[PDB]
């Protein structure tokens, strides 16, 4: 919901 | 009723704790190795700040930081979580045989009741641009449970801002907005909304990473000391700046990142989201200027970044910058809750 | 208390109308050329259903479909929009010199007043999997304003369902869930949550497109006739199926898409989201079976897909399936509201 | 999430 961005992997 | 419900629209709160109820979203944060491993090192290397101590974990999510506090020999850890993730945390506490040491307490830290005061509070309450989510205010609210001379982990937070040049990015956003310039979209004139569109597209903070060569001056630092701040200190955050420009070019906006320090009795451990550091799930944040500022090396770019808390768990951001040597001024609004996640 | 308020949690509503309030989100739909261009053709090629008629536009957004009704000669168009986009539609009506013929009415179509009955209702209320958003129910509700023998554009909707095999998509789920099958994630045994993780990932419908070769039997069709249907008819949607399998393999779930038809006086025009047609912003939707089923060509895969409307403007989906020749069975529950966008 | 992003041409 536009809260935490995806971790880079 | 509660300090939380007073400052938060219900529609924000439901959606917010919904997001954190997904194991996928807890796993997202957990799999940030820089985040999760720095927290573990901060806790384990400062074992004496935990050994035989009482601990409050604010927003325990999976339980992961509560586990590190237990690994460090905490006597008792109160793990507070307002999402349904609280139920999954209690499963992990049982399955890791830590029922004697970790006590999950479901609900908001503003609303729950704890059995006793605590020696130290741990949390990971940082949103993007540090302040998104307003969870720092829950972290500070929790000091009502902290003993005198008790500690906070993290202890302080530094926001860095610096000016940048990136015409590609600027142009990317400008072009999206220019859809609304069309005088004949399927034979319909949209052009009357061009202004409202550019306004909306440039309200959006850009979340991604970049090379440090795009920075035009050394960063300005603004510090929040979590031991000393009170909740209300975060209602209106004014960050003045004066930049000594090291490069000539167009300034397309301000770039933001943050560091937090765990100031322990053994050592301080830094967790950095800077663009010179290994990348985190927070990336970095850029606020674009609708109208770029030209500046020459040696000019000063001065102004104010003002953050005003809202009821949607975020901030209304105004950025006013000027090039002192020409009186060229840029005023900008930014809706921190509506970001453009640009990273790939 | 409106029909809308009673079926919808306020927290869903707020977020829902916030989304459509963004010019960028209107733009996203407008830029789907297949969607927008087919709406234009349906309306313009059936100009005699619009010439000098009274029209209602249910959820007008930017105004686009009402502008097409005007291009087709409509006398009066009431354009209803509940988000703040209403203000922007008014700006375009003024700038296109159409205030005499298009009246923007801000609000929910369940709550506003219309000054008169209409000849034809136009809308684009199709969510992914057709039914997501529960806006079909707003479109049906609006028939209270339709003159007897008034028309609906679109006129009917057909959902298609077919079994598929996609081993790699299936295995993606366990890969993601197997994060939790770690006995020492930074020293924490996560394994006890592995089944909960699996279940959460399998509850997500998968939005993306695919090669038609994955499909294992001809589709079954479930039709909603918008001229005839009542709001209540969409609270419980039961789609029985008996697939005669054309290919042998492991069935990993059911694939869904939809068509609508505008049955005009001059011609019927179709808008299809099928995987054989050009791609739309709806893609297609796959629901996985957490235990897949072996079927050989010639077998019958029988079962039911049951969509039960909820107060978050979506559906709880229950899919139950069996291969009749073996008796092997799969039961699956999905949350339509929370998909995986896999095209991204 | 409500409507998915339109396919990039
Ligand atoms: N007022 C509050 N009371 C209790 N929990 C909260 C509150 N605000 C946010 N949270 C939770 O705090 C957590 C924030 C996460 N960043 C941290 C998860 C976990 N501690 C970790 O580091 O992996 C989420 O699980 C939220 O649901
Ligand atoms: N109950 C309702 N009353 C009024 N408007 C609604 C309702 N439900 C959804 N909407 C609006 O319907 C629109 C749905 C869009 N797919 C259609 C927009 C526009 N007509 C187009 O074809 O581009 C959004 O702008 C919603 O805010």
């Amino acid at each position: 919901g536009a809260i935490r961005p995806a971790a880079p992997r | 009723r509660s300090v939380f419900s007073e400052r938060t629209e219900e529609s924000s709160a439901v959606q917010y704790f919904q997001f954190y109820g997904y194991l996928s979203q807890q796993q997202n944060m957990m799999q940030d190795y820089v985040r999760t491993g720095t927290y573990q090192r901060a806790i384990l290397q400062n074992h004496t700040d935990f050994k035989d101590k009482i601990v409050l974990d604010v927003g325990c999510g999976s339980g992961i930081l509560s586990f590190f506090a237990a690994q460090a020999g905490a006597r008792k850890i109160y793990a507070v979580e307002a999402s349904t993730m609280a139920q999954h945390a209690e499963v992990l506490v049982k399955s890791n045989n830590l029922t004697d040491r970790i006590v999950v307490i479901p609900g908001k830290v503003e609303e729950v009741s704890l059995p006793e005061q605590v020696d130290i509070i741990i949390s990971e309450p940082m949103g993007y641009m540090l302040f998104n989510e307003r969870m720092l205010e829950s972290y500070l609210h929790a000091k009502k449970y902290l003993k005198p001379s008790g500690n906070m982990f993290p202890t302080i937070g530094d926001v860095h801002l610096a000016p940048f040049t990136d015409e590609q990015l600027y142009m990317e956003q400008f072009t999206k907005a220019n859809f609304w310039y069309q005088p004949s979209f399927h034979g319909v004139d949209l052009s009357a909304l061009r202004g409202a569109a550019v306004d909306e597209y440039f309200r959006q903070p850009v979340v991604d990473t970049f090379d440090i060569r795009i920075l035009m001056a050394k960063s300005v630092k603004y510090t929040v000391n979590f031991l000393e701040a009170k909740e209300g200190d975060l209602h209106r955050i004014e960050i003045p700046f004066k930049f000594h420009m090291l490069h000539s070019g167009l300034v397309h906006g301000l770039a933001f990142w943050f560091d937090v320090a765990f100031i322990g009795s053994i050592m301080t451990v830094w967790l950095s989201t800077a663009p010179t550091e290994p990348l985190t799930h927070w990336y970095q944040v850029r606020c674009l200027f609708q109208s770029p500022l030209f500046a020459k090396a040696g000019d000063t770019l001065s102004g104010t970044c003002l953050l005003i808390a809202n009821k949607r768990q975020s901030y209304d951001i105004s950025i006013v910058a000027q090039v002192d040597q020409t009186g060229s001024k840029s005023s900008n609004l930014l809706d921190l809750k509506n970001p453009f996640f640009r990273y790939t």
Side-chain angles (χ1 to χ4, degrees), chain A, chain B:
Chain A
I3 294 167
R4 289 307 181 87
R9 184 102 278 246
Chain B
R1 330 206 193 288
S2 70
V3 172
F4 183 98
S5 50
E6 286 289 273
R7 82 167 105 108
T8 319
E9 278 166 31
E10 198 172 321
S11 170
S12 200
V14 180
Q15 198 260 292
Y16 185 76
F17 294 116
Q18 212 82 78
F19 172 96
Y20 279 122
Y22 285 99
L23 288 157
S24 68
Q25 295 297 350
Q26 295 296 328
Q27 167 184 356
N28 182 60
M29 301 180 290
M30 291 162 81
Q31 291 200 276
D32 184 339
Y33 186 66
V34 172
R35 189 193 80 106
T36 300
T38 305
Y39 266 82
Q40 188 173 35
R41 190 153 49 76
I43 287 160
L44 300 184
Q45 291 258 66
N46 290 295
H47 53 265
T48 55
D49 297 320
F50 295 91
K51 174 82 182 155
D52 304 334
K53 303 289 186 64
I54 306 297
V55 178
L56 170 59
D57 185 356
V58 182
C60 67
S62 77
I64 190 67
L65 311 177
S66 293
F67 295 104
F68 301 156
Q71 293 166 1
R75 168 185 148 185
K76 188 74 73 165
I77 301 137
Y78 301 106
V80 177
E81 170 60 45
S83 76
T84 54
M85 192 57 41
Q87 287 48 87
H88 303 307
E90 162 81 299
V91 169
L92 291 186
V93 172
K94 288 173 181 223
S95 65
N96 288 264
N97 305 290
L98 281 172
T99 52
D100 58 333
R101 295 166 69 204
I102 304 173
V103 187
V104 173
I105 300 176
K108 303 168 187 65
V109 73
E110 296 86 350
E111 291 171 13
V112 305
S113 301
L114 299 199
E116 59 181 313
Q117 303 293 91
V118 311
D119 297 304
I120 184 166
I121 305 182
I122 65 187
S123 188
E124 193 271 276
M126 299 92 71
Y128 58 77
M129 207 188 192
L130 180 63
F131 297 116
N132 189 58
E133 305 179 48
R134 293 189 69 178
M135 183 169 165
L136 287 177
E137 292 170 80
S138 309
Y139 183 39
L140 295 172
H141 175 95
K143 289 192 281 193
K144 73 188 188 176
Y145 299 114
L146 186 58
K147 284 156 93 194
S149 309
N151 210 349
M152 300 283 272
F153 259 35
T155 321
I156 74 196
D158 290 337
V159 179
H160 291 261
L161 40 162
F164 72 84
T165 199
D166 189 343
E167 89 176 317
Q168 194 205 291
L169 172 59
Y170 181 84
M171 285 303 283
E172 170 173 4
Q173 298 298 79
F174 186 74
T175 299
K176 292 173 182 173
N178 260 350
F179 173 88
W180 293 99
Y181 188 83
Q182 285 174 105
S184 191
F185 180 78
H186 297 261
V188 182
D189 189 352
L190 309 184
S191 79
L193 292 172
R194 191 226 164 159
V198 173
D199 286 31
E200 175 185 299
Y201 275 112
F202 285 79
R203 257 185 274 140
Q204 305 194 253
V206 184
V207 189
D208 66 355
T209 200
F210 49 85
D211 196 312
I212 65 141
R213 77 190 58 163
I214 81 170
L215 298 183
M216 295 173 80
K218 170 162 259 191
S219 76
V220 156
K221 184 159 75 187
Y222 173 93
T223 303
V224 172
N225 177 336
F226 299 129
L227 288 166
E228 313 297 337
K230 33 206 67 163
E231 272 182 74
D233 301 344
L234 296 188
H235 289 165
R236 189 181 171 276
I237 305 164
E238 196 179 346
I239 308 181
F241 56 85
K242 200 155 173 242
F243 290 115
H244 301 272
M245 301 304 298
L246 303 170
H247 300 281
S248 289
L250 302 170
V251 186
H252 283 108
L254 296 176
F256 294 89
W257 63 94
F258 69 89
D259 306 332
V260 300
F262 303 86
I263 296 173
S265 303
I266 298 176
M267 69 182 88
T268 291
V269 166
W270 282 97
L271 173 48
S272 187
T273 65
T276 50
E277 291 297 330
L279 193 56
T280 74
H281 84 283
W282 291 289
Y283 302 83
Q284 287 95 39
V285 181
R286 281 183 285 165
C287 294
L288 283 156
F289 295 162
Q290 296 195 7
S291 320
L293 293 178
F294 182 67
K296 297 291 266 89
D299 294 341
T300 57
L301 176 75
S302 75
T304 307
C305 177
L306 188 68
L307 306 96
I308 297 170
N310 62 44
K311 304 293 211 74
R312 300 182 303 290
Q313 300 178 91
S314 193
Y315 283 86
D316 304 334
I317 300 187
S318 69
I319 295 158
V320 165
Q322 80 164 28
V323 191
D324 291 328
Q325 287 75 352
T326 57
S328 177
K329 192 183 184 177
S330 187
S331 303
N332 310 267
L333 298 188
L334 274 108
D335 176 16
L336 190 65
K337 218 199 160 78
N338 178 38
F340 168 37
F341 281 4
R342 185 168 180 253
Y343 59 83
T344 174

